[PDB]
Amino acid sequence: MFVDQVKVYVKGGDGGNGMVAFRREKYVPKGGPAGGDGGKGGDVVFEVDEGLRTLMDFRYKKHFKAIRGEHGMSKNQHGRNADDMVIKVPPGTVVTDDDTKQVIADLTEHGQRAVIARGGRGGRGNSRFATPANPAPQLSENGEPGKERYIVLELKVLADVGLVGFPSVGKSTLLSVVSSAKPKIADYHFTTLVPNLGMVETDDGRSFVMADLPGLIEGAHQGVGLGHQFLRHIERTRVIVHVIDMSGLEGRDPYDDYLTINQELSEYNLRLTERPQIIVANKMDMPEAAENLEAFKEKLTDDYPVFPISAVTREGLRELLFEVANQLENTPEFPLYDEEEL
Ligand SMILES: [Mg+2]
Numbered sequence: 001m002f003v004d005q006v007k008v009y010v011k012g013g014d015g016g017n018g019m020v021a022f023r024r025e026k027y028v029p030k031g032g033p034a035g036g037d038g039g040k041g042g043d044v045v046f047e048v049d050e051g052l053r054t055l056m057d058f059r060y061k062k063h064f065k066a067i068r069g070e071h072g073m074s075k076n077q078h079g080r081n082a083d084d085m086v087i088k089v090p091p092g093t094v095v096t097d098d099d100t101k102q103v104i105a106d107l108t109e110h111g112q113r114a115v116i117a118r119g120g121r122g123g124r125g126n127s128r129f130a131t132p133a134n135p136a137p138q139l140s141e142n143g144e145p146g147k148e149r150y151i152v153l154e155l156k157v158l159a160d161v162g163l164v165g166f167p168s169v170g171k172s173t174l175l176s177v178v179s180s181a182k183p184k185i186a187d188y189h190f191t192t193l194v195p196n197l198g199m200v201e202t203d204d205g206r207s208f209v210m211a212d213l214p215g216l217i218e219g220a221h222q223g224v225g226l227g228h229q230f231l232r233h234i235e236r237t238r239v240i241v242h243v244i245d246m247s248g249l250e251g252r253d254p255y256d257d258y259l260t261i262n263q264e265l266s267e268y269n270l271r272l273t274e275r276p277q278i279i280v281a282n283k284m285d286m287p288e289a290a291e292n293l294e295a296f297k298e299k300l301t302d303d304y305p306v307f308p309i310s311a312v313t314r315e316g317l318r319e320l321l322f323e324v325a326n327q328l329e330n331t332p333e334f335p336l337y338d339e340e341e342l
């Protein structure tokens with residue numbers, strides 16, 4: 001029900017211009033065409049790479065231009081075909097022309113690639129235009145221009161990390177601070193459920209989709225067959241970032257809230273207790289918060305890494321997102337049933 005969309009400009013290589021030359025040896029004479037042909041320009045090619053999860057790259061650079069083919073040379077030596085510009089895109093990416101509004105490619109398998117903007121053919125040299133009434137032609141072909149087109153990339157968005165914890169703890173303000181961008185809804189204006197999810201971006205290029213688990217879970221409990229959708233979506237979210245409070249404007253006992261939340265999770269019987277977790281001790285800027293984490297760290301018996309941060313900032317969360325990313329690359333999906341049907 002959520003999809004990311006980005007428009008960019010792609011252009012294939014123009015392709016080398018043919019040459020105009022002649023064999024000029026010290027044979028007391030001169031003549032005979034020798035201009036080599038041009039090489040084809042390169043293609044802008046999209047390739048699927050499961051390692052990717054968001055179209056966040058196409059946001060910092062929306063201009064992809066392939067290299068031009070090689071120009072023809074004398075000695076009838078032709079130019080080689082320029083290498084293509086391969087651009088890695090997430091699985092399930094649909095590419096359409098922002099004009100002919102057509103589907104250029106529907107990339108879905110890893111390694112699956114498609115020609116997005118093809119490069120022009122190389123221009124033929126003079127050696128090609130020689131006829132009996134033109135033994136020494138001065139005609140040459142310039143390279144065929146690489147096609148340029150404005151495209152839009154569409155992607156079906158599915159959460160990767162889930163946010164749990166008491167309300168007002170920060171799950172919302174947090175998911176918002178790191179939320180470099182939010183998806184669009186394609187079922188808009190009815191159930192208006194709209195779980196709270198967003199695409200965050202680390203500082204090393206990596207990126208992923210984060211959401212507030214409760215919202216997803218509550219949608220997986222709707223009737224008239226509307227839960228299945230959210231069930232699948234939950235199998236997708238592989239990491240859990242637990243946010244506890246270390247102060248308590250009206251709350252008390254940190255390790256307590258940790259127990260309360262982790263229990264509910266296991267009660268939904270969805271395997272949310274198997275999913276890796278990353279505790280986030282927030283509100284660390286408070287007095288009591290200093291020693292609370294001291295005790296909390298002790299009582300904690302799990303292997304889950306604790307990331308304490310003060311003032312939810314886009315920078316002070318640098319080391320957090322990083323872990324989320326690393327963990328995310330070492331954790332498998334959580335399907336309810338395996339491939340044991342036979
Ligand atoms: Mg960065």
Ligand SMILES: [Mg+2]
Binds near residue numbers: 222223225226
């Ligand atoms: Mg249902």
